[PDB]
Amino acid sequence: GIFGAIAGFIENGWEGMVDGWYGFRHQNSEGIGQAADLKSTQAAIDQINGKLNRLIGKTNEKFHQIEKEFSEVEGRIQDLEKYVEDTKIDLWSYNAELLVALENQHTIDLTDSEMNKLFEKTKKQLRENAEDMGNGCFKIYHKCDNACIGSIRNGTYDHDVYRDEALNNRFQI
Amino acid sequence: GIFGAIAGFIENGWEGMVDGWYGFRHQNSEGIGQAADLKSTQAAIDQINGKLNRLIGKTNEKFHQIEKEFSEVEGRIQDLEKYVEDTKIDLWSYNAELLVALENQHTIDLTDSEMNKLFEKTKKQLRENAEDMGNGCFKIYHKCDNACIGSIRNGTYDHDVYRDEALNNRFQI
Amino acid sequence: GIFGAIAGFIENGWEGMVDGWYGFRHQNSEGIGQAADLKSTQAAIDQINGKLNRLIGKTNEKFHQIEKEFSEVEGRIQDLEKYVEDTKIDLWSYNAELLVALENQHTIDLTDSEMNKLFEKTKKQLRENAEDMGNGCFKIYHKCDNACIGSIRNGTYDHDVYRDEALNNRFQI
Amino acid sequence: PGATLCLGHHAVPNGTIVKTITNDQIEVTNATELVQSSSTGEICDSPHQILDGENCTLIDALLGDPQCDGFQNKKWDLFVERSKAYSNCYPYDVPDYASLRSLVASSGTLEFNNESFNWTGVTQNGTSSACIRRSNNSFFSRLNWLTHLKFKYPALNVTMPNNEKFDKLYIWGVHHPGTDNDQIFPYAQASGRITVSTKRSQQTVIPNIGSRPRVRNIPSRISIYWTIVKPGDILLINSTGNLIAPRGYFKIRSGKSSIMRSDAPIGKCNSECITPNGSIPNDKPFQNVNRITYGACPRYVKQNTLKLATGMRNVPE
Amino acid sequence: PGATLCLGHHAVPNGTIVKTITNDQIEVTNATELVQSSSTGEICDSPHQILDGENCTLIDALLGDPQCDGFQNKKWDLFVERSKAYSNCYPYDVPDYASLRSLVASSGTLEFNNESFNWTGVTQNGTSSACIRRSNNSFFSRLNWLTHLKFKYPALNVTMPNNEKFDKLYIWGVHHPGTDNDQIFPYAQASGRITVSTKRSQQTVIPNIGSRPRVRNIPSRISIYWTIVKPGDILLINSTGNLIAPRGYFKIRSGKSSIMRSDAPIGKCNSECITPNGSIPNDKPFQNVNRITYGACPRYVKQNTLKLATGMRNVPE
Amino acid sequence: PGATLCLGHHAVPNGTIVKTITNDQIEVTNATELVQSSSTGEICDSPHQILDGENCTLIDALLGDPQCDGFQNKKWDLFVERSKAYSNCYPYDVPDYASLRSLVASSGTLEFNNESFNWTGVTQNGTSSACIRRSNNSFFSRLNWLTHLKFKYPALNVTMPNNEKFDKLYIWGVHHPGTDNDQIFPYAQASGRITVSTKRSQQTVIPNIGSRPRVRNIPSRISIYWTIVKPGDILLINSTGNLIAPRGYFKIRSGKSSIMRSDAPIGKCNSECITPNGSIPNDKPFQNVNRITYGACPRYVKQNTLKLATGMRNVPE
Ligand SMILES: *[C@@H]1O[C@H](CO)[C@@H](O[C@@H]2O[C@H](CO)[C@@H](O[C@@H]3O[C@H](CO[C@H]4O[C@H](CO)[C@@H](O)[C@H](O)[C@@H]4O)[C@@H](O)[C@H](O[C@H]4O[C@H](CO)[C@@H](O)[C@H](O)[C@@H]4O)[C@@H]3O)[C@H](O)[C@H]2NC(C)=O)[C@H](O)[C@H]1NC(C)=O
Ligand SMILES: *[C@@H]1O[C@H](CO)[C@@H](O[C@@H]2O[C@H](CO)[C@@H](O[C@@H]3O[C@H](CO[C@H]4O[C@H](CO)[C@@H](O)[C@H](O)[C@@H]4O)[C@@H](O)[C@H](O[C@H]4O[C@H](CO)[C@@H](O)[C@H](O)[C@@H]4O)[C@@H]3O)[C@H](O)[C@H]2NC(C)=O)[C@H](O)[C@H]1NC(C)=O
Ligand SMILES: *[C@@H]1O[C@H](CO)[C@@H](O[C@@H]2O[C@H](CO)[C@@H](O[C@@H]3O[C@H](CO[C@H]4O[C@H](CO)[C@@H](O)[C@H](O)[C@@H]4O)[C@@H](O)[C@H](O[C@H]4O[C@H](CO)[C@@H](O)[C@H](O)[C@@H]4O)[C@@H]3O)[C@H](O)[C@H]2NC(C)=O)[C@H](O)[C@H]1NC(C)=O
Ligand SMILES: CC(=O)N[C@@H]1[C@@H](O)[C@H](O[C@@H]2O[C@H](CO)[C@H](O)[C@H](O[C@]3(C(=O)O)C[C@H](O)[C@@H](NC(C)=O)[C@H]([C@H](O)[C@H](O)CO)O3)[C@H]2O)[C@@H](CO)O[C@H]1O
Ligand SMILES: CC(=O)N[C@@H]1[C@@H](O)[C@H](O[C@@H]2O[C@H](CO)[C@H](O)[C@H](O[C@]3(C(=O)O)C[C@H](O)[C@@H](NC(C)=O)[C@H]([C@H](O)[C@H](O)CO)O3)[C@H]2O)[C@@H](CO)O[C@H]1O
Ligand SMILES: CC(=O)N[C@@H]1[C@@H](O)[C@H](O[C@@H]2O[C@H](CO)[C@H](O)[C@H](O[C@]3(C(=O)O)C[C@H](O)[C@@H](NC(C)=O)[C@H]([C@H](O)[C@H](O)CO)O3)[C@H]2O)[C@@H](CO)O[C@H]1O
Ligand SMILES: *[C@@H]1O[C@H](CO)[C@@H](O[C@@H]2O[C@H](CO)[C@@H](O)[C@H](O)[C@H]2NC(C)=O)[C@H](O)[C@H]1NC(C)=O
Ligand SMILES: *[C@@H]1O[C@H](CO)[C@@H](O[C@@H]2O[C@H](CO)[C@@H](O)[C@H](O)[C@H]2NC(C)=O)[C@H](O)[C@H]1NC(C)=O
Numbered sequence A, B, C: 001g002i003f004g005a006i007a008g009f010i011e012n013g014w015e016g017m018v019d020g021w022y023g024f025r026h027q028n029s030e031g032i033g034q035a036a037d038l039k040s041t042q043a044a045i046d047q048i049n050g051k052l053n054r055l056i057g058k059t060n061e062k063f064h065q066i067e068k069e070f071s072e073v074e075g076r077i078q079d080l081e082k083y084v085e086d087t088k089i090d091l092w093s094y095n096a097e098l099l100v101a102l103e104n105q106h107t108i109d110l111t112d113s114e115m116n117k118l119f120e121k122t123k124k125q126l127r128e129n130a131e132d133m134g135n136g137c138f139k140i141y142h143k144c145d146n147a148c149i150g151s152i153r154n155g156t157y158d159h160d161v162y163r164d165e166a167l168n169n170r171f172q173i
Numbered sequence D, E, F: 001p002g003a004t005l006c007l008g009h010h011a012v013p014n015g016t017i018v019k020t021i022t023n024d025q026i027e028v029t030n031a032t033e034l035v036q037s038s039s040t041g042e043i044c045d046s047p048h049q050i051l052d053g054e055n056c057t058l059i060d061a062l063l064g065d066p067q068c069d070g071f072q073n074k075k076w077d078l079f080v081e082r083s084k085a086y087s088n089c090y091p092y093d094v095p096d097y098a099s100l101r102s103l104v105a106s107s108g109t110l111e112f113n114n115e116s117f118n119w120t121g122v123t124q125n126g127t128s129s130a131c132i133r134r135s136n137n138s139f140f141s142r143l144n145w146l147t148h149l150k151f152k153y154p155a156l157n158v159t160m161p162n163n164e165k166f167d168k169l170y171i172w173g174v175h176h177p178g179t180d181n182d183q184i185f186p187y188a189q190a191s192g193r194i195t196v197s198t199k200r201s202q203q204t205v206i207p208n209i210g211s212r213p214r215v216r217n218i219p220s221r222i223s224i225y226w227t228i229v230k231p232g233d234i235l236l237i238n239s240t241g242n243l244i245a246p247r248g249y250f251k252i253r254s255g256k257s258s259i260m261r262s263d264a265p266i267g268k269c270n271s272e273c274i275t276p277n278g279s280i281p282n283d284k285p286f287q288n289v290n291r292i293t294y295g296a297c298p299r300y301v302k303q304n305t306l307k308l309a310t311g312m313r314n315v316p317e
């Protein structure tokens, strides 16, 4: 939410992307394609596994404790026993509620951040050869076949190769 | 703070904007105007009401508890009673302090984020017809009357209509 | 991490920058230089000192408490004493662990944010006279001696002075 | 010429200071208080059932001290004891006073059923000048002071089964005589012994003859004890003297009931949360009025104010 | 013509609802449960040593009630008391029953060493029809009921030094006779006194003659007390009657041992965390099965579900 | 040609590892320790008033055991009991030893005012060979062992009003004789009874004659009890024998005072926070030295280190 990509300038997610969390869709001369980005996907996943490592399978051994149910009315010492247990349980119940609320807010934010970082990285890569349409798509102003698209996804795209073609197309009348 | 807009590249807020939290000021041929943006304003407000729903009117019923003042010196059991209550109160006092510090830091950050998202959204909308002056204002390089400005605020501005005019003005000598 | 600059589009830090946390490296006609930015550096440092003011030297006076070791087997009341202390210690141990994890995540994020804000601020300042290479460096398309660089660092750079030179160089064939 | 379009945000002339993680003082456009710090000074009589003890402690109403006759069989969500309260009957003590008070307060009722104990061979209804009821020498309404019949006090061996659904609470006592005469006049013999037993319990108590400092001209004391009898079980009272016997039992319930020491007046008003200083609103999540609370209440914290920002950072013109 | 390149993220048809700081309901692609809310209903016999009490309380096994003879010298990580349990020996009570239970449960062993106390001039091994062992009148296996020899019960003054490395735990008692005959038959004289002392402790106990409601046809009672003797220190038993003497001592250990009330069956399975409802998995950090736990367990919370998001916000087509 | 302008951040050759929400090991440029884990091993004598008990427990100094004569009327913020401490007077016990220790430690003073009790008809100042003071048979300095005058010990009925602003604390005792001779020699009669009463309290205590294991050649014991007397109220001592009477009262204060078991030496140094292991700095918010603390101290946590990052993520060349 806090970065503005997921449920923001990206209108919706893609149900047909099942091999990654983030990726690329394109239209060119050779057709309409989809490929997942592994690095952004793994970066989000590693962070979420980070939180899980701290929460799953981390329990604390306790043995002899106080009594916590009673068959007899006894007064003062039993009031104290009950009160201590009730106090404890509210404090942990509070910790659990807060914990999940903050972690969930952070997970939503870091997943939105990875989307944004992928978008920005791709924008810089394209230099003057493309324009941001504002909905997470770039209009690329040169012929860009499947090898060319592939090169943008793998981080090997050389903007100098197409720059002349692109400026001619962009600053046309 | 963390996004750099409020108390950052935006030099100050506007006291004369009383109908929204975020908005637009413009100078054109027809004069100097101000209009609030409702969507960004409501997005920030909904999140803050979010926090309030979790904090206001959510109290916990407690009934018979332990005694917490004493007229007699009694020793061991009274020490334990006092110590339990003192322990409890410090833990809740800690929870309350931390809670407000984190929420306040988050509120400041999410309000800064909404400013930033509005700014970015407007920048993309303008395409090549405007430049970012770095203080949250755009220089628009075409004639832009009140209907045109209105169209940028409502998200209906078509950059293609003015693009020729704008590039001619931008890349002049 | 969450902004994408430190350990992101900036490939690594600079060990030879010892007078600030953030700064500028340049190559021009007059050579290759380095200068730290004081404002971004102080902004990060003030926030971290912020956290330290809340954590260092803030301790709580406690005096007569309960007993916490025992030489005798006594049963019920001793079970309660031990259980209260054990309960307390786990709750504080939890508070300390969570506190440091959140603060550390926030410190990493706000330091990344200051990097990003400096970068963005510099980008806006350059207007159409430079391009973002995607690795935190700008290619500046005009002659830019040490006074000119100095002017970008001090926030006094006037982009209009060089704009003609720069557009001619950028949109060349 | 073209146009200029500036993006921006609001501000206010009068900001408020809040704390954050990185800064103990930052100005925001608006904030709200999370710590409740004031009461009206009244205990609201709704929506909880409030029983004002007035001149009576809970224990005095339990035993049946004459100025507490109005409390008979009353219930309460919250019993309020006043600091002006005082006893005006036979001087007495309760080993574990605090526990008896607590378990009665928590039960939340003074409902009393009379029982007909077979007290053959003793004189019932012993009274004193220390416990005046309706201008006549009297005693605790729930207690039955047994003395001699024709200068003989034979061994008592009286039984009472609990065939009910609930626990019965029996309240009873031992007369500790001040002098030899205070033992001879009522029991016309040397010493008493009291053994109150059940299938699962036994309490045994010896009177100790001896002068105590006078309270309402009386150097003797009564010591009060109690016994709970489960369904199926049976009370057995065995006595050779000095027994302050029960006239029946109290019902013991479980529920939300309690007791609070307070000198705040009771008002005609509706508030969910009660403190000794008066009722308090419960909109806020925290309060610094009193660690002692009853009802749906904010949690007690040491801080007197905690501001939650409800607006952006304030950056005025 | 050129090309279009769209950046994006996945989504799923079936999202789940989670809570956040700003929103109580937001849909994410995936989540996992942090509150464990179910058991199989069995207490797993591994990897903790479980001792099923069956018909016996811990205290009945301690004293040596005949139906608990199988428990002699057993150890346990966790002792499980069943609600069907019942006593079948001489009726008795324990002042501070709860503390004795607790310290024995915590010690985690019933290891008993016999000692030869010099009981010259009394008759040992007194029995009753209330405590049947192998179709014969018997008594508690760890206790030694002393009566008269040739209609005389002289003063006992018996000693036993602790020369061991560990604390010894001595369990002993006082016979409270129901009637005059229950005092004359066993001790053939009027009254007893028992003083159990060490260098650092003394307990003294008077028998009180008096009828209690019959339990297994017996109106008398035994009252059970205990004494810990440190290394270097010495036990001293001084008695003129009514002593239910120890036959030796129990070792008292420290360790991880405890006790739990539960009617759940014991199963052939391996689980680290035990509750009275049965064992539970301990993958999750929180649980709402029972506040009573033994082992490596999730912490008890009031909430029945807490979803942690493990995916981005879900924004379907 | 133009120019290149690179934005960047610093780094260091020697980073440190910290924990975050998403990663248990991330390298930052700098960090600081939040858990204090060391002491110098000394208890600093400033700025709190430290009273080193040396060979004396608090209770021995209270009673007035001869080797503790130097403690008379001393005050303390913190009383330090040493494990080498030992008693060297008449053997004694205290029912609720722990509570008496605690309330005296918390009061923080041994200030004692003598009072002139009307002990007519008995002999004062009884002594023993077990309690040597200045090479002569003596007794506890605050206690007054009453014996017979001309082979008669009449009934005592002595009174003492509290007309002060403060609560008085009275310390007193009962002599439990070892044998018949230990009762006849001092009181020249069969049995004692002690009843210490106020308007609001009564304690009554019977001596029990009986041999205890010898401690400093003595098979008798003294049992120590206490009584608090409010302003307006009156102490009453009623005795027919075996009374170890008070010579006056102790002031009981409220304040910050306490007691700590420790074998650490006292040093000439200034530290706000004391543990049994020695004083510790209190810059850090947490500590893992000891759960037992006195003063302005970091809170005790189970962790031995917690690093707070004070720098950005370290990403070296
Ligand atoms: C600074 O920030 C705070 C928090 O966001 C704002 O304070 C809130 O302001 C709103 C609107 O002005 C208040 O809403 C009103 O609440 C009434 C109930 O108030 C009582 O009960 C609540 C507990 O729920 C307590 O917090 C409070 O102290 C009161 O005791 C409603 O009855 C009101 O409803 C009115 O309008 C509706 C129409 O929609 C009608 O249906 C009603 O009949 C009625 O006429 C109203 O909703 C709210 O109480 C405030 N909250 C808090 C926590 O204080 C400030 O407005 C803001 N300041 C500025 C300058 O913007
Ligand atoms: C929604 O989000 C959750 C959390 O990220 C995902 O659930 C996890 O999914 C993975 C993989 O499917 C699970 O991993 C498996 O764990 C097994 C052990 O499971 C038990 O123990 C754990 C405690 O550690 C409990 O949480 C759990 O309930 C079980 O009782 C391993 O044995 C599995 O290993 C298998 O593969 C490896 C090969 O790498 C082999 O070595 C093994 O032999 C074996 O064949 C496996 O690692 C994990 O348990 C789940 N975690 C939680 C917390 O539930 C969901 O997948 C995700 N949903 C979707 C649709 O993506
Ligand atoms: C890694 O990160 C940490 C935390 O940011 C840095 O450590 C701090 O460094 C500063 C400066 O070097 C230290 O400041 C000094 O504090 C002195 C008091 O120290 C004692 O008391 C504090 C409690 O308040 C304890 O934390 C500490 O352990 C000591 O027991 C002052 O007296 C010093 O003042 C000096 O300079 C001023 C001039 O401005 C003069 O007025 C004084 O007379 C004196 O000469 C000084 O302020 C600070 O103590 C450190 N804090 C912590 C928490 O450790 C590291 O510097 C940083 N590492 C790197 C490599 O950058
Ligand atoms: C100056 C002075 O005090 N002299 C006492 C004298 O008071 C005392 O006699 C007793 O005095 C009290 C008043 O303080 C009562 O009048 C006692 O009478 C009653 C009572 O009201 O308490 C009468 C009552 O009917 C009795 N009830 C029963 C069931 O027996 C009780 C009861 O016996 C006693 O209260 C038990 O403690 O007494 C009156 O006895 C004499 C007596 O020795 O001593 C002078 O020194
Ligand atoms: C109808 C009725 O109950 N009448 C009682 C009659 O029971 C009672 O006699 C006693 O009865 C019980 C059964 O309830 C036992 O039979 C008692 O005998 C034993 C016992 O088994 O308990 C015999 C045993 O050998 C004795 N052991 C020793 C060491 O002395 C014990 C022991 O003395 C007593 O249990 C101590 O309390 O007794 C039997 O005595 C008579 C007795 O007065 O009263 C009728 O009213
Ligand atoms: C070998 C052996 O122990 N034989 C004992 C013999 O010790 C014992 O006599 C008593 O011995 C102790 C020493 O252990 C003391 O000497 C006792 O004398 C004193 C005392 O110092 O304790 C004298 C003192 O003046 C007395 N004070 C008062 C106020 O009366 C006290 C006091 O009476 C007693 O301590 C009370 O317990 O005693 C001395 O009595 C004899 C006595 O029966 O028994 C042998 O077997
Ligand atoms: C024991 O001492 C008390 C205190 O002097 C005596 O009680 C006083 O007795 C007189 C006359 O009987 C009363 O007027 C006083 O009010 C009593 N004062 C107090 C404080 O109780 C008591 O009589 C003495 N007891 C015996 C048996 O002689
Ligand atoms: C005191 O009263 C009880 C109750 O009536 C008597 O105990 C009963 O005695 C009969 C015959 O001996 C038994 O069958 C009953 O089972 C007993 N009932 C209970 C509840 O204990 C007791 O005998 C009386 N005591 C004396 C000494 O007379």
Ligand SMILES: *[C@@H]1O[C@H](CO)[C@@H](O[C@@H]2O[C@H](CO)[C@@H](O)[C@H](O)[C@H]2NC(C)=O)[C@H](O)[C@H]1NC(C)=O
Binding pocket: E157, E158, E159, E234, F179, F211, F212, F213, F214, F219
């Ligand atoms: C009861 O037994 C104890 C233990 O044997 C006796 O105390 C011993 O008595 C001798 C000689 O009088 C002393 O030297 C020992 O030091 C004592 N030992 C202990 C452990 O106290 C005691 O005398 C006996 N009591 C009676 C009244 O006969």
Ligand SMILES: *[C@@H]1O[C@H](CO)[C@@H](O)[C@H](O)[C@H]1NC(C)=O
Binding pocket: A147, A148, A150, A151, A154, A156
């Ligand atoms: C990009 O990467 C994929 C392998 O992941 C490969 O199939 C494709 O041909 C690559 N294209 C270019 C232009 O590098």
Ligand SMILES: *[C@@H]1O[C@H](CO)[C@@H](O)[C@H](O)[C@H]1NC(C)=O
Binding pocket: B147, B148, B150, B151, B154, B156
């Ligand atoms: C934009 O929206 C406002 C209504 O909110 C309307 O008055 C204005 O005319 C609109 N202008 C255009 C160009 O859509």
Ligand SMILES: *[C@@H]1O[C@H](CO)[C@@H](O)[C@H](O)[C@H]1NC(C)=O
Binding pocket: C147, C148, C150, C151, C154, C156
């Ligand atoms: C920029 O600032 C530095 C002083 O910090 C100065 O030495 C330099 O000459 C300045 N240059 C310009 C062009 O302002």
Ligand SMILES: *[C@@H]1O[C@H](CO)[C@@H](O)[C@H](O)[C@H]1NC(C)=O
Binding pocket: D054, D055, D067
């Ligand atoms: C309560 O006691 C006071 C003072 O003795 C008296 O004036 C008032 O009338 C009493 N009220 C009741 C209800 O007994």
Ligand SMILES: *[C@@H]1O[C@H](CO)[C@@H](O)[C@H](O)[C@H]1NC(C)=O
Binding pocket: D154, D155, D156, D157, D193, D194, D195, D238, D239, D240, E209, E210, E211
């Ligand atoms: C109990 O009552 C019975 C029968 O009247 C009698 O034999 C016995 O002595 C009494 N005991 C006590 C302690 O009152």
Ligand SMILES: *[C@@H]1O[C@H](CO)[C@@H](O)[C@H](O)[C@H]1NC(C)=O
Binding pocket: D037, D038, D039, D276, D277, D288, D289, D290
């Ligand atoms: C409430 O009453 C207590 C009495 O102990 C007092 O200390 C406290 O200051 C009062 N608080 C308020 C807010 O009136």
Ligand SMILES: *[C@@H]1O[C@H](CO)[C@@H](O)[C@H](O)[C@H]1NC(C)=O
Binding pocket: E054, E055, E067
């Ligand atoms: C437990 O008691 C029940 C009911 O009396 C009986 O059927 C069962 O056989 C007993 N088991 C043991 C082990 O004593």
Ligand SMILES: *[C@@H]1O[C@H](CO)[C@@H](O)[C@H](O)[C@H]1NC(C)=O
Binding pocket: E154, E155, E156, E157, E193, E194, E195, E238, E239, E240, F209, F210, F211
């Ligand atoms: C203790 O035993 C001794 C010696 O047999 C005897 O003199 C004394 O009276 C006994 N006391 C008690 C309370 O049993």
Ligand SMILES: *[C@@H]1O[C@H](CO)[C@@H](O)[C@H](O)[C@H]1NC(C)=O
Binding pocket: E037, E038, E039, E276, E277, E288, E289, E290
């Ligand atoms: C476990 O047993 C307790 C018995 O008090 C019961 O209240 C609770 O609901 C049970 N919980 C589950 C999850 O079976």
Ligand SMILES: *[C@@H]1O[C@H](CO)[C@@H](O)[C@H](O)[C@H]1NC(C)=O
Binding pocket: F054, F055, F067
């Ligand atoms: C403390 O006791 C020891 C050992 O008996 C002795 O050497 C030392 O002098 C004593 N100190 C005081 C102050 O009594």
Ligand SMILES: *[C@@H]1O[C@H](CO)[C@@H](O)[C@H](O)[C@H]1NC(C)=O
Binding pocket: D209, D210, D211, F154, F155, F156, F157, F193, F194, F195, F238, F239, F240
């Ligand atoms: C208390 O002292 C009085 C008067 O001397 C006497 O009559 C009575 O028996 C004494 N009682 C006790 C228990 O000492």
Ligand SMILES: *[C@@H]1O[C@H](CO)[C@@H](O)[C@H](O)[C@H]1NC(C)=O
Binding pocket: F037, F038, F039, F276, F277, F288, F289, F290
């Ligand atoms: C402090 O003393 C305690 C004694 O129980 C010991 O266990 C602990 O390890 C000591 N800690 C340090 C840091 O010296």
